[PDB]
Amino acid sequence: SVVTKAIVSADAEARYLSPGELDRIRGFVSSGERRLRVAQTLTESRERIIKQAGDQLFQKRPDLVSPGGNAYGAERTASCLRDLDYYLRLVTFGIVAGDVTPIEEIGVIGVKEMYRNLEVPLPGMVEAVKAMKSVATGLLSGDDSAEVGYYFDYLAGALA
Amino acid sequence: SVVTKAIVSADAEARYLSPGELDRIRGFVSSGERRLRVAQTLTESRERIIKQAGDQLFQKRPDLVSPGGNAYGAERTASCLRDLDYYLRLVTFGIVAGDVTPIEEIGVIGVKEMYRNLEVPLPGMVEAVKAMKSVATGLLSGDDSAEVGYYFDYLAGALA
Amino acid sequence: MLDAVTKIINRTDAEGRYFASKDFDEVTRFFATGEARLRAASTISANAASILRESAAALFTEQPDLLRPGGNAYTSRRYAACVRDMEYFLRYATYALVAGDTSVIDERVLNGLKETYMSLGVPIPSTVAGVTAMKGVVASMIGSEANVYFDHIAKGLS
Amino acid sequence: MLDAVTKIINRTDAEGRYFASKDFDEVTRFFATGEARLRAASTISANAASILRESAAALFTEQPDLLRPGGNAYTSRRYAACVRDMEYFLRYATYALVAGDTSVIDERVLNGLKETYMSLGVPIPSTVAGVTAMKGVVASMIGSEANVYFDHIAKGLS
Amino acid sequence: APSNQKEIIKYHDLLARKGLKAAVDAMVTTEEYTEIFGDDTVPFARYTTDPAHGLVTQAYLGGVLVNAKHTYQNRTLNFPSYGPGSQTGGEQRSLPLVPERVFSLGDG
Amino acid sequence: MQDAITSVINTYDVQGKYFDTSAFDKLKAYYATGELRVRAAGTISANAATIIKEASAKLFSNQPDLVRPGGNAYTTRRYAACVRDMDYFLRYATYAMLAGDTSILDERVLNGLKETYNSLGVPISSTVQGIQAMKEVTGSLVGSGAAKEMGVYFDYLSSGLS
Amino acid sequence: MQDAITSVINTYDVQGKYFDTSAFDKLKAYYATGELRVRAAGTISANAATIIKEASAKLFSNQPDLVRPGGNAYTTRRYAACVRDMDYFLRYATYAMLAGDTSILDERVLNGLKETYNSLGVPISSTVQGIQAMKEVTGSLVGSGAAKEMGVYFDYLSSGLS
Amino acid sequence: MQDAITSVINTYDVQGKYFDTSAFDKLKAYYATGELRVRAAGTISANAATIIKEASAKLFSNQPDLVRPGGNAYTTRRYAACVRDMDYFLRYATYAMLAGDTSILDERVLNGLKETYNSLGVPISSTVQGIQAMKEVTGSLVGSGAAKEMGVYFDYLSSGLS
Amino acid sequence: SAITKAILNADAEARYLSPGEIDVVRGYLASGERRVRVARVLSDNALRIVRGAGDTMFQKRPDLVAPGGNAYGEVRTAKCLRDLDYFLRLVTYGVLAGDTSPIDEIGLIGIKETYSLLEVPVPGVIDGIKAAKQQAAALLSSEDAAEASFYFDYVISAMS
Amino acid sequence: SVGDLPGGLWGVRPGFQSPPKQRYRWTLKQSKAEKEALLEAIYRQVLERVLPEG
Amino acid sequence: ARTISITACVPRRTKSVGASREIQNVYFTKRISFDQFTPEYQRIHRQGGTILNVQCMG
Amino acid sequence: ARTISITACVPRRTKSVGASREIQNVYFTKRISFDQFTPEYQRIHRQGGTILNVQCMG
Ligand SMILES: CCC1=C(C)/C(=C/C2=NC(=C\c3[nH]c(/C=C4\NC(=O)[C@H](C)[C@H]4CC)c(C)c3CCC(=O)O)/C(CCC(=O)O)=C2C)NC1=O
Ligand SMILES: CCC1=C(C)/C(=C/C2=NC(=C\c3[nH]c(/C=C4\NC(=O)[C@H](C)[C@H]4CC)c(C)c3CCC(=O)O)/C(CCC(=O)O)=C2C)NC1=O
Ligand SMILES: CCC1=C(C)/C(=C/C2=NC(=C\c3[nH]c(/C=C4\NC(=O)[C@H](C)[C@H]4CC)c(C)c3CCC(=O)O)/C(CCC(=O)O)=C2C)NC1=O
Ligand SMILES: CCC1=C(C)/C(=C/C2=NC(=C\c3[nH]c(/C=C4\NC(=O)[C@H](C)[C@H]4CC)c(C)c3CCC(=O)O)/C(CCC(=O)O)=C2C)NC1=O
Ligand SMILES: CCC1=C(C)/C(=C/C2=NC(=C\c3[nH]c(/C=C4\NC(=O)[C@H](C)[C@H]4CC)c(C)c3CCC(=O)O)/C(CCC(=O)O)=C2C)NC1=O
Ligand SMILES: CCC1=C(C)/C(=C/C2=NC(=C\c3[nH]c(/C=C4\NC(=O)[C@H](C)[C@H]4CC)c(C)c3CCC(=O)O)/C(CCC(=O)O)=C2C)NC1=O
Ligand SMILES: CCC1=C(C)/C(=C/C2=NC(=C\c3[nH]c(/C=C4\NC(=O)[C@H](C)[C@H]4CC)c(C)c3CCC(=O)O)/C(CCC(=O)O)=C2C)NC1=O
Ligand SMILES: CCC1=C(C)/C(=C/C2=NC(=C\c3[nH]c(/C=C4\NC(=O)[C@H](C)[C@H]4CC)c(C)c3CCC(=O)O)/C(CCC(=O)O)=C2C)NC1=O
Ligand SMILES: CCC1=C(C)/C(=C/C2=NC(=C\c3[nH]c(/C=C4\NC(=O)[C@H](C)[C@H]4CC)c(C)c3CCC(=O)O)/C(CCC(=O)O)=C2C)NC1=O
Ligand SMILES: CCC1=C(C)/C(=C/C2=NC(=C\c3[nH]c(/C=C4\NC(=O)[C@H](C)[C@H]4CC)c(C)c3CCC(=O)O)/C(CCC(=O)O)=C2C)NC1=O
Ligand SMILES: CCC1=C(C)/C(=C/C2=NC(=C\c3[nH]c(/C=C4\NC(=O)[C@H](C)[C@H]4CC)c(C)c3CCC(=O)O)/C(CCC(=O)O)=C2C)NC1=O
C-alpha cells in the first residue's frame, strides 16, 4: 500500500521516514473514507458490473465466443466472467490500499505466462478490462471515476 | 600482533611467509625484552600516569569538570579517570603485541559511536590522550619514549 | 525462582568464576537489609486483610463506575475476582520483598496477565490505579520498602 | 508410525486399487534388504554407548565453547540433556532403519523438537553438527544404510 | 545468503527460464553489487549488518552458516525455501487418535 | 512487507471474497488511527538519538556488568554494536507502528535474531531489558495513545526474543 | 551428470579394466536405442508447450481446488510457478531419456525438492498427479517404445517425490 | 587467529587486568622461542615441496590401494587433490607453529573437515597417516627442538581429524 | 517366554491371539530344536567358558585383582567367577525361552544398583561378558554363535 | 576481545578460501605479483578454491 | 498421621458389560489418607457400591 | 558479437566523502558486450554520471 511503499523506501535507506513520506501517509489516511466508499460502491454492484462488462466484451469481440474462440461455450464463457470478477475484486483491493500493489501481487505477476498456457488472447483481456473500466466508472462519481480509472488503466497496461 | 599480521598476509596469498615477513618477525622477537621492560614500567606507574594526566587535562580543558561538563562531579570524574586507565592498559597491550591491533580492536572500533552515545566530547578524548602521552613518555628514555609516543599518536588520530 | 543471592551466584557461574570481593560486598548488603525486609513482610502479612480493605475502598472511591452495573467490578463474583487480584498483588509483592528481587513478579504475575485482562475485558488502567492505591496503603504502614515492587507491577501492567 | 509395507499399502489404498506388479516388486525389494538392515540395527544396538561417546567427543571437539561457562552445554544437567538427545537420535534412527520409513522420527522425535530448541535456546546448527557427526560414526561402522535417516533428523531441525 | 522467499524467487526464475548466464548477469548488475563491491573489488563474504544493502539478520545468519562450510561439505539445501511449513512436513502428518498403547493394571 | 490494510486484503483474497462489512470496519479503524500513528512516528524520528541514549543508560545502569570487562558490551565495538541494535529495534518498531502490523518485525528483525544472538553469545534477557527500557522512554515521549500503540510492537519484539 | 556410456566407463575405470564383451554389449545396447531417443527428444521439444497445456489442464480439472482461491496454484504468480515446475519435469525427463540414465534426476531435480515443497506448502500428491498427467500426454505424442522409455523417468520422478 | 601474545592479551583483557609477573613470564617465553620458530618456518618453507613428496611417497607406499583404481586418490584429479590437501595441512601447521597457538587450525582447517571427508568418501584414517608422514619428514628436516614444537601442531591436526 | 509375550499382548486389549501373534508363536515352536541344541552346548561347556572369560578379563584390566581392587582376595574372585557363571546360565535361559524376560527377572533387574553399591566396575563386568561371548562363539556353529550372541549382547547392553 | 573471526560459534572459514577480513581491489597500475594474487582471489571466492594447473 | 484401609464391592450395573477385565474395580481394598476418607466414601456410595470393611491400623 | 567502448564520468554527489582511493571508478573507459550496453548506459545515468564517449570497436 501507500504506507508499505513509504516504509520500504525509508528502510531501503536505513532511516526514519522523511517529512515527504509522512506527508504521503497523511494524505493517504485522510482519503481513506472516500476510498472505502468507492470500493463499497463497486462491491455492491459486482454482479451488474461483470454482467454488463461481459456483454460489451462479447458484442465488441464476437469471435471470442464464436466457435473456435477461446471463450466458446458456457463453461469457457463462465471462466471468462470469473476472471473479470477476479480483476474487479483486485481493483477494489487496490482502491482500499491506495496503490496497485495488491493487483500486481495477485493478478499481474506471471499473468502472461498463465494466459499463454491457457491460450487466452491478451488483447481480448485488454478490451475486457476496458469494458469493465467503462462499466465501473459509470457507477461512480466524477472525482472517483478518474481515480478508479487509473487502476483499470494500470491493469490494462499490465495485460498489454 | 606482528606475528599474526605476517601470518594473515601470507594466508591471504595462500603461501608460506616470505623472507621479508620472517625478517619482520625476527625484528619483533629480538626487541621483545625492551618492550616488555617498557610495558612493565608503564604498568608499575599507572596511578601516577592517570593522576598527572587527569590533572593536566582538567587544567587545559577545565569545562569538562565544571558544572555542565561531561566529567562534572566526583563519580563522573572517576569514570573519566577509569577510561584513561583503560587506554593506558590498551597501550601496554599494544606495546607487547608490537602493533596497534589490540588497541584498535578493543578501544577504537565503534569508539566514536560509543562516545557519541555517552555524550563524551571527542576532542576532550584527544586532549586526554595527548596528556597521557606526555606523562607516560616523561617516565621513559628517549628511544622508548618515541615508540610509546607512536602508540599514543595512533590513539589521538583514531579519536580525532 | 530467584532471589538476590541466587542472582549473584548465577552471574558468577555463567562467568565461570569464584566469588570476588565485589560479589561478597553485594551479598553482605543483601544480608544487611534482610532483617528490615522481613519486618516489612511480616507486617504486610499480619495486616493483609486491612490492606485489602483499605485499598479496595480507595480504588472504588476513586472510580465509583466500576461498581455500578455495566462496570467490570459489578457483581459479587466480579468484585470477588477484583479483590482476589489485589490479594495476589500484595502476596507476590511480599514474596519479592523477602527475595529482594522482582523476578518472581515477572514470572508468576506479569507474564500472561496483560493477555488475561484483555481476554476478560478487565480495565488495565483501573487495575494499575488499584495497585497504586495498594502501594500507598502499604507505604502508610511499613514505610518505603515495598514501593519498588508495586512500581514493578504497575510498569509491567501498563 | 508406518513402515515400507504400510507406506505402500496406504499408497495403493489412496487409489483404491489392488497391488499391481510394481507394488509387489517394491515390497519384494524391501523384503530383500531386511537381513542387511537387521544386522546393521543389531550392530548399532551393540555399540550404542561407543557411538554416543565418539559422537559427543566429535561435537565438543568441533565446538568447545558449548562446554565452557555460558555455553548451552555448560552444566552437568545441560550436558546430560545433550547426550540424551543424541542417544534419542541414535535409537530412533535405528528404529527408522528397521522400519525402512522415516515416520517414526516424525512421530516421536520431530514432534515439537524444533520449537522446543528455539524456545530453550538450544543452538540448532550445533545440534545438526552433532547429528551429522553421529551419522559419520554410524556410517564408519555399518556403512551408508542409515545416512538418510540421520539426514531426516537434521532436516527436521533446520 | 538469501534472506527471504522473494530473493530466492528472483534468481530461481532466472535459472528456470534463462539459465545460469542470465542469473549471473542479473546478480552482478544489481545495485547492491555496485554499492558494496563496485567495479574493481573482488566480492567478499559480508559479516556486518547492513539492511540498506541486504544484510538483515537472516542474511547474516545464513551467510555465516554457508561461509563456515567447506566446498562439497554436503549436498543439503541450506535455503530450500522460506515458507509456512517445515522441510520434513511433519505438520501435515496425521496424528493417532489414541496412543499406540495404554497402561493399566487391569490390562495386565 | 504487510501493513494492516494488506493484511485484511490477504485474508479476504485467500478466501476469495469481496470486502464484507467487518472488513470495512477494520479498514475504517486503521484509517481512524492514521494521523495518530503519523504524529507518533514524527515525534520518535525527532528524538531517536535521545531515546536511544536514555534507554541505553537505563539498561546499563540496571545491569552494570554488561559494560565492565567480561560483559558482552565490553569493548568499543561491542558497545557500538549494542547501541546500534537498540537503534534498529526502535526504527523497526516505528515502522511497524506506522504499518499497524508486526509483519515487518518478523521478516526483517525477528527471523533468525534469536539464533544469531545465541551463536554470538549476546545475552537475550539483557536485550529484552533494553527493549523494555526503550518502551518506557518512547512511551513517556509520545504520550498515552501513541504509547499504547508503540508498546504493542515493543512487546512483539520482546516476545520474539524471549 | 552421468549418461549410460559414462556409466559403463565409470564402472570399468573404478575396477580399472579395459572394456570386455559385457561392456561392449551395454554400449551396443545404448547405441541401438539412440535414434529412438533422439526422435523422441525432438518430438517432445517441438511439442513441449502443448504437452504442458494439456497436462496442466487435466491436473486442474481433476483437482479444481488448486487454482481456486485458497489453493497453492491460486495467483498468476503461483499458477505461473506451477506450470514452470511442470516445464522442469518435462525437460529433465527428456534429458534423462536422451542420456538413458536417471543420475541427472537425482543431481538436478530430486535433491532437496521434497524439502523445498514442504517448506513452501506445495502439495506433493498433486505434483505427482501432474507428473502422471504429463506422462500420459507425452506418451500420446511419442509412440510405443518412446512412451515406455519416457515413462521410466516420469515414474522415477514420481517415486522420488512420492 | 590468536597467537601466544594475543592469547595472554585476551585473558587479561577479559579479566580487565594489567599484565602481572605471570603474564610477563609467558610473553617472555614466547619471545625466547621466537627465533627457533622463525628458523623452523624458514626451513619448512624452503623444503615444503620436498616434504610433500617424501610424505606422500610414504603414505602411498604404506597404503598402495589408495592410488590404484578404486582408491580415493586414483585419478590425476583426485591425486592432485590429495597432495594439495597435504600441502595445505603443512602450511597451516607452519602458521600455527609460528604463532605458538593452535587457534588457526580451529579457525581455518579442522571445522567441518571431518564431515566433508565423510561426505566425499575421503578415508580419514589415511589422511591422518599422511599427516603423520609429514610430521616425521618435517621433524627430520627441522631438528629436535623444532621437531618437538612442530609435532604439537601436527598432532593437533591428527587429533582434530580423529 | 516368547509365548507369554504374545499372550500378554493379546490380553492387554482383551482379544484372542492375532495372526501375527500366532505366527510369532509358530516360529518360536519351530525354532525350539535349534534353541535346545544351542542351550545344551552352552550348558555342557559352562565351566571352561567361565574360566576363559575370567582369565581374559583379569588379563585385560589387572586392577580388579590388584590390592584395593574389588576382586582382590580369593573370596571376591570366587564371587566374580560365580557372577560370570550366573550370567552364562541366564544366557542359556534366554536362549531356551526365546526372549530376555528370564535374564531380566533373575539377574538384570537391580544389578545396576547392586554393583553401584558394592563399587563393582560395570566396564569390567562388560569385559567379562564379552570374553564369555567370545569363548562361547569359539565352540559354536555360526548360526548357533549368532543365536547366543544376541543374548550376550543383550546382557552387555543391560550392564551399560 | 582480540583476533576473533566474525560469527561467534561459527567464526570459521575454510583455508581454501580467503581470510574473512581480506579485501582485494584492482588498481590501474600495480605490480604483476599483485595482479596474480588478485586473480587467485577471484578464483578463490567464486569457485571456492584454487583450480588445478591448466 | 493416620490412614484408613477401606474394602468395598462396587457393582458395574449402571455401565454396560465389557470384554475388558474389570474384577479389580469391582472388589477392592485400598489405602487412603484420612483427608480422603470422606470423598471416596461418598464416591463409592454414588456408584452403588457397598462398603464392606473399614480399618485404621495403629 | 560486438563490443562497445564507453568512456564515462560518474561522480559521487549523492553520498559522503571517504578516505579510500576512488578515482578509477569515477572516471573510466571500459568496453562491454552489446547485451550489457543498455544496463550500463542506464546505470551511468541513474548515478548522475555523464557518458563522454561511445565507440564501436571494429
Ligand atoms: C486471481 C488471479 C487469477 C486469474 C485471473 C486466473 C485466471 C484463469 N483462467 C482460467 C481459464 C479461462 N479464462 C478465460 C478468460 C478469457 N476468455 C476470453 O478469452 C477473455 C479474453 C478472457 C477473459 C476476459 C477462459 C476462456 C478460460 C478457459 C480456457 C480453457 O479452459 O481453455 C484458468 C484455468 C482454471 C479455471 O478455469 O478456473 C485460470 C487459472 N487465475 C488466477 O489465480
Ligand atoms: C448485583 C450483585 C451484587 C451484590 C449482592 C453486591 C454486594 C456488595 N456489597 C458490598 C459492600 C457493602 N455491603 C453492605 C451491606 C451490609 N450492611 C449491613 O451490615 C447489612 C447486614 C448488610 C446488608 C443487609 C454495606 C454497608 C457495604 C459497604 C461497606 C463495606 O465496605 O463493608 C460490596 C463491595 C463493593 C461496594 O462497596 O459497593 C458488594 C460487592 N454487589 C453486587 O454487585
Ligand atoms: C497470581 C497472579 C494472578 C493474577 C494477577 C491473576 C488475575 C486474574 N483475574 C481474573 C478475573 C478478574 N479480575 C478482575 C479484576 C478487575 N476488575 C476491575 O474492576 C479491577 C480494576 C480490576 C482488579 C483491580 C475481574 C472483575 C475479573 C473477572 C472477569 C470476568 O470474569 O469477566 C482471572 C481469570 C480467573 C477468574 O475468573 O477469577 C485471572 C487469572 N491471576 C493470577 O493467577
Ligand atoms: C524421545 C524424544 C525426545 C527428544 C528428541 C527430546 C529432546 C529435548 N531436549 C531438551 C533440552 C536440551 N537439549 C539440549 C541439547 C543441546 N545442547 C547443545 O549444546 C547441543 C548442540 C545440543 C545437543 C546435540 C540441551 C542442553 C537441553 C537443555 C536446555 C535447557 O534446559 O536449558 C528438551 C526440553 C526438556 C528437557 O530438558 O528434557 C527436549 C524435549 N526429548 C525427548 O523426550
Ligand atoms: C535490522 C535488524 C537487525 C538486528 C536487531 C541485528 C542484530 C545483530 N547484532 C549483532 C552483533 C551484536 N549485538 C550486540 C548487542 C548486545 N550487546 C549487549 O549484550 C546487549 C544485551 C545487547 C543489545 C541491547 C553486540 C555486543 C554485538 C557484537 C557481538 C560480537 O561481535 O561479539 C549482529 C551480528 C552482525 C554484526 O555485528 O553486524 C546482528 C545481526 N541485525 C539486524 O540486521
Ligand atoms: C576498554 C575500551 C572501553 C572504553 C574506553 C569505554 C569507555 C566508557 N566510558 C563510559 C562512561 C564515561 N566516560 C567518561 C570520560 C569522559 N569524560 C570527559 O568528558 C573526558 C573527555 C572523557 C575521558 C577522558 C565519563 C565522564 C563517563 C561517565 C558519563 C556517563 O555516565 O554517561 C562508559 C559507560 C559505561 C560505564 O560507565 O562503565 C563506557 C563504555 N568502554 C570500553 O569498553
Ligand atoms: C589413471 C590416471 C593415473 C595415472 C596416469 C597415474 C600415474 C602414476 N604413476 C605413478 C608412479 C610412476 N610413474 C612413472 C612413469 C614415468 N617414468 C618415466 O619417466 C616416464 C616418462 C614416465 C611414464 C611413461 C614412474 C617411473 C613411476 C614410479 C615413481 C616412484 O617409484 O616413485 C604413480 C604413483 C603410485 C604408483 O606407483 O602406483 C601414479 C599415481 N595415476 C593415476 O591415477
Ligand atoms: C585448508 C583447509 C581445507 C582442507 C583440508 C580442505 C580439504 C578438501 N578436500 C577435498 C577433496 C579431496 N581430498 C582428497 C584427499 C584425500 N584422498 C586421499 O585418499 C588422501 C587419504 C587424502 C589426502 C592425504 C581427495 C582425493 C579429494 C577429492 C575427492 C573427490 O572429488 O571425490 C575437498 C572438496 C573440494 C575440492 O575438490 O577441492 C575439500 C574442501 N578444504 C579446506 O578449505
Ligand atoms: C543370578 C542373579 C544374581 C546376580 C547377577 C548376582 C550378582 C551379585 N554379586 C554380588 C557380590 C560380588 N560380585 C562380584 C563380581 C564383580 N566384581 C568384580 O570386580 C567383577 C568386575 C565383577 C564380575 C565380572 C564380586 C567381586 C562380589 C563381591 C563384592 C563384595 O563382597 O562386596 C552380589 C551381592 C551379594 C553376594 O555377595 O552374593 C550380587 C547380588 N547375584 C545374584 O543372585
Ligand atoms: C477376566 C476375569 C473376570 C471375571 C471372571 C469376572 C467375573 C464378573 N462377573 C460380574 C457380573 C455378573 N456375572 C454374571 C454371570 C453369572 N451369573 C449367571 O447366573 C451365570 C450362571 C453366571 C455366568 C456363567 C452375572 C449375571 C453378573 C451380573 C450380576 C450383577 O452385578 O447384578 C462381575 C461384576 C462386573 C459386571 O457386572 O460387569 C465380575 C467382576 N470379571 C472379570 O474381569
Ligand atoms: C588518492 C587519489 C585521488 C584523488 C586525487 C582524487 C580526487 C577527486 N576529487 C573528487 C571530488 C572533489 N574534489 C574537490 C577539490 C576541491 N575543489 C576546489 O574547491 C578545491 C580548490 C579543490 C581542493 C583543494 C571537490 C570540490 C570535489 C567535489 C566536486 C563535485 O562533486 O561536484 C573526485 C570525484 C569523486 C568524489 O567526489 O569523491 C575525485 C576522484 N580521488 C582520488 O581517489
Closest to G115 measured CA to CA, from A20, H4, E76, C98: E76
**Ligand located closest to K23 CA:** 10
Residue H144, ligand 7, Cβ within 6 A: no
Instruction: Please say whether the beta carbons of D134 and D89 come within 8 A.
Output: yes
Method: cryo-EM
The answer to whether the Cα torsion of K24, K28, K33, K35 is positive or negative is: positive
Residue K19, ligand 10, Cβ within 6 A: no
Pairing of strands K27-33, K50-55: unpaired
Instruction: Please say whether the beta carbons of B5 and B99 come within 8 A.
Output: yes
| Nearest residue (CA) to ligand 4, atom 37 | D81
**Ligand located closest to K10 CA:** 10
What is the C-alpha separation between D30 and D8, in angstroms, rounded? Answer: 11
Residue E70 alpha carbon to ligand 9 centre in Å = 52
HSE-CB of I86 using CA atoms within 13 angstroms: 14
Vertex C122 angle, CA C120 and C126, to 5°? 175
Q: What is the dihedral of CA C103, C108, C113, C116, to 10 degrees?
A: 160
Contact: F76, B117; criterion CB under 8 Å: no
What is the C-alpha separation between E63 and J10, in angstroms, rounded? Answer: 10
Residue type, E88: T
Q: Quick one: resolution in A?
A: 2.5
Residue H113, ligand 8, Cβ within 6 A: yes
- What's C112's DSSP letter? T
Closest to D149 measured CA to CA, from D99, D115, D114: D99
| Residue K6 main-chain phi, psi, to 5 deg | -125, 130
Beta strands in A26-79, from DSSP E residues, in sequence order: none
Contact: H18, B92; criterion CB under 8 Å: yes
What is the C-alpha separation between I11 and K37, in angstroms, rounded? Answer: 34
B10 touches chain H (CB under 8 A): yes
The number of helix segments (H) and strand segments (E) in chain J equals: 1, 0
Residue F81 alpha carbon to ligand 5 centre in Å = 5
Residue K13, ligand 10, Cβ within 6 A: yes
Instruction: Please say whether the beta carbons of F92 and F134 come within 8 A.
Output: no
Contact: J10, E44; criterion CB under 8 Å: no
What is the C-alpha separation between H139 and H149, in angstroms, rounded? Answer: 9
Q: Do chains D and H touch (3 or more CB pairs under 8 A)?
A: yes
Taking CA atoms, J11 is separated from H9, I115, J22, in Å, by 19, 46, 15
Angle, helix A122-139 to helix A46-60, in steps of 10 degrees: 130
Q: Which helix (H) or strand (E) holds K27?
A: strand K27-33
Find cell 572500533 and name the residue.
Answer: B109
Find cell 464416591 and name the residue.
Answer: K43
Taking CA atoms, E71 is separated from I58, J14, J43, in Å, by 49, 8, 13
Instruction: Please say whether the beta carbons of F114 and F161 come within 8 A.
Output: yes
Instruction: Please say whether the beta carbons of K25 and K39 come within 8 A.
Output: no
**Ligand located closest to H96 CA:** 8
G13 touches chain H (CB under 8 A): yes
Q: Which residues of C touch D74 (CB under 8 A)?
A: 16
Q: What is the dihedral of CA H53, H59, H64, H70, to 10 degrees?
A: -90
Q: Collapsing DSSP states into helix, strand and coil, what is residue B117? A: helix
**J40 Cα to chain D: minimum distance (Å):** 29
Q: Do you know the residue count of chain D?
A: 158
What is the C-alpha separation between C120 and D102, in angstroms, rounded? Answer: 44
Q: Which helix (H) or strand (E) holds J40?
A: helix J32-46
**E27 Cα to chain J: minimum distance (Å):** 13
Q: Is C87 exposed, middle or buried (0-12, 13-18, 19+ CB in 10 A)?
A: middle
Closest to G134 measured CA to CA, from G60, G56, G81: G56
Residue K22, ligand 10, Cβ within 6 A: yes
What is the C-alpha separation between G76 and G138, in angstroms, rounded? Answer: 25
What is the C-alpha separation between B25 and K5, in angstroms, rounded? Answer: 87
Residue D99 alpha carbon to ligand 4 centre in Å = 25
| Nearest residue (CA) to ligand 7, atom 34 | H67
Instruction: Please say whether the beta carbons of E38 and E44 come within 8 A.
Output: no
Find cell 515487518 and name the residue.
Answer: F104
What is the C-alpha separation between B133 and B148, in angstroms, rounded? Answer: 8
**F107 Cα to chain D: minimum distance (Å):** 17
Contact: E76, D154; criterion CB under 8 Å: yes
CB atoms within 10 A of CB C84: 11
| 3-state SS string for I65-103 | CCCCCCCCCHHHHHHHHHHHHHHHHHHHHHHHHCCCHHH
What is the C-alpha separation between J7 and J53, in angstroms, rounded? Answer: 33
Q: Which helix (H) or strand (E) holds K3?
A: strand K3-9
Residue D149 alpha carbon to ligand 7 centre in Å = 42
Ligand 7 atom at minimum distance from H57 CA: 32
**Ligand located closest to F117 CA:** 5
Closest to A155 measured CA to CA, from A97, A96, A106: A106
F17 touches chain H (CB under 8 A): no
Residue type, I42: L
**Ligand located closest to D74 CA:** 4
What is the C-alpha separation between F124 and D122, in angstroms, rounded? Answer: 13
Residue L18 alpha carbon to ligand 11 centre in Å = 11
What is the C-alpha separation between J45 and J26, in angstroms, rounded? Answer: 15
Residue F88, ligand 5, Cβ within 6 A: yes
Which three three-digit cell numbers place residue A119?
491460450
Q: Is G15 exposed, middle or buried (0-12, 13-18, 19+ CB in 10 A)?
A: exposed
The neighbours of chain K, by the rule of 3 or more Cβ pairs under 8 Å, are: E, I
Q: Which residues pair with L6 in a beta bridge?
A: L30, L54
Contact: I153, D42; criterion CB under 8 Å: yes
Checking G42-45 for CB contacts under 8 A at 24+ apart, the result is G43/G141, G43/G142, G43/G146, G44/G90, G44/G94, G44/G138, G44/G141, G44/G142, G44/G150, G45/G94
Residue H85 alpha carbon to ligand 7 centre in Å = 20
CB atoms within 10 A of CB L33: 12
| Nearest residue (CA) to ligand 10, atom 1 | K21
**F139 Cα to chain B: minimum distance (Å):** 20
Q: Which residues of E touch J36 (CB under 8 A)?
A: none
What is the C-alpha separation between A93 and F17, in angstroms, rounded? Answer: 11
**D46 Cα to chain I: minimum distance (Å):** 6
What is the C-alpha separation between E19 and E25, in angstroms, rounded? Answer: 10
Contact: F119, J8; criterion CB under 8 Å: yes
Which three three-digit cell numbers place residue A90?
483486485
The neighbours of chain G, by the rule of 3 or more Cβ pairs under 8 Å, are: A, E, F, H
What is the C-alpha separation between G149 and G40, in angstroms, rounded? Answer: 9
Q: Which residue of H has its CA nearest to E75?
A: H119
Q: How far is CA D91 from the centre of its chain?
A: 7
- What's A157's DSSP letter? H
Question: Nearest Cβ partner of E68 from H112, H119, H120?
Answer: H112
List the alpha helices (DSSP H) in chain H. 4-14, 21-46, 48-62, 76-99, 103-105, 113-120, 124-142, 144-161
A8 touches chain E (CB under 8 A): no
Q: Which helix (H) or strand (E) holds K28?
A: strand K27-33
Residue H22, ligand 8, Cβ within 6 A: no
G73 touches chain A (CB under 8 A): no
Q: Collapsing DSSP states into helix, strand and coil, what is residue J49? A: coil
What is the C-alpha separation between I17 and I10, in angstroms, rounded? Answer: 6
Residue B83 alpha carbon to ligand 6 centre in Å = 6
Q: Do chains D and K touch (3 or more CB pairs under 8 A)?
A: no
What does the DSSP assignment read for G110-148? ITTHHHHHHHHT--HHHHHHHHHHHHHHHHHHH-HHHHH
Closest to I88 measured CA to CA, from I30, I41, I19, I123: I41
First to last CA, chain C: 24
**G133 Cα to chain A: minimum distance (Å):** 15
What is the C-alpha separation between F65 and H16, in angstroms, rounded? Answer: 12
Contact: E105, K25; criterion CB under 8 Å: no
Task: Provide the edge-to-edge strand list for the sheet that holds K3-9.
Answer: K27-33, K3-9, K50-55
| Nearest residue (CA) to ligand 6, atom 35 | F67
HSE-CB of F145 using CA atoms within 13 angstroms: 10
Closest to G44 measured CA to CA, from G152, G133, G150: G150
Pairing of strands L50-56, L3-9: antiparallel
Taking CA atoms, I31 is separated from A59, F26, I35, I96, I145, in Å, by 86, 74, 6, 10, 15
What does the DSSP assignment read for chain D? ---HHHHHHHHHHHTT----HHHHHHHHHHHHTHHHHHHHHHHHHHTHHHHHHHHHHHHHHH-GGGTSTTSTT-SHHHHHHHHHHHHHHHHHHHHHHHHTSTHHHHHHTSSSHHHHHHHHT--HHHHHHHHHHHHHHHHHHH-GGGHHHHHHHHHHH-
Question: Nearest Cβ partner of J2 from H6, H77, H113?
Answer: H6
Q: Which helix (H) or strand (E) holds F46?
A: helix F34-46
HSE-CB of F69 using CA atoms within 13 angstroms: 19
Vertex F114 angle, CA F111 and F117, to 5°? 125
Taking CA atoms, C73 is separated from C109, C112, C129, C137, F140, in Å, by 20, 21, 14, 20, 29
List the alpha helices (DSSP H) in G15-123. 21-32, 34-62, 76-99, 103-105, 113-120
Q: Which helix (H) or strand (E) holds I3?
A: helix I2-12
What is the C-alpha separation between C39 and C19, in angstroms, rounded? Answer: 29
Residue C67, ligand 2, Cβ within 6 A: yes
